[PDB]
């Protein structure tokens, strides 16, 4: 089974493996497309940290480099960085998969519109 964000921040949800060894770039995009999703882009991460998302977890993107959105300095997720940080790695290297849903429009899937 895959673990997904409970709550996508602008479009975006962070996807794994329930257990190790995680996915290589190939593998992570096709994490996404077995869920109806894409690979997020960099640019697609940078926006949702930007409305609070964060993560302990490098993921793959669509510019074949893995990132890590923080917004807190904690020693174990990306050694205390804040921002969104990234990791220029082979191909071939275990990740989990940033993916992201282009039927999203609220900021926070969690959160709906004042009705
Ligand atoms: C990625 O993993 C798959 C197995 O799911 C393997 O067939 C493929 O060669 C791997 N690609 C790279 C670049 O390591
Ligand atoms: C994508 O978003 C739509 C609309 O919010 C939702 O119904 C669907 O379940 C989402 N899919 C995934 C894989 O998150």
Known sequence: ??????????GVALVGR?????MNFTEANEACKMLGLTLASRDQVESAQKSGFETCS????????????????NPR?????????????????????????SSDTWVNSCIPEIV
């Open 1 to 10: 089974d895959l673990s997904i964000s409970t709550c996508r921040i602008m």
């Open 18 to 22: 329930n257990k190790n060894p995680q």
């Open 58 to 73: 490098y993921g793959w993107v669509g510019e074949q480099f893995s990132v890590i959105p923080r917004i807190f300095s």
């Open 77 to 101: 997720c990306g050694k205390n960085g804040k921002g969104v940080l990234i990791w220029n790695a082979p191909s071939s290297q275990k990740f989990k998969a940033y993916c992201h849903n």
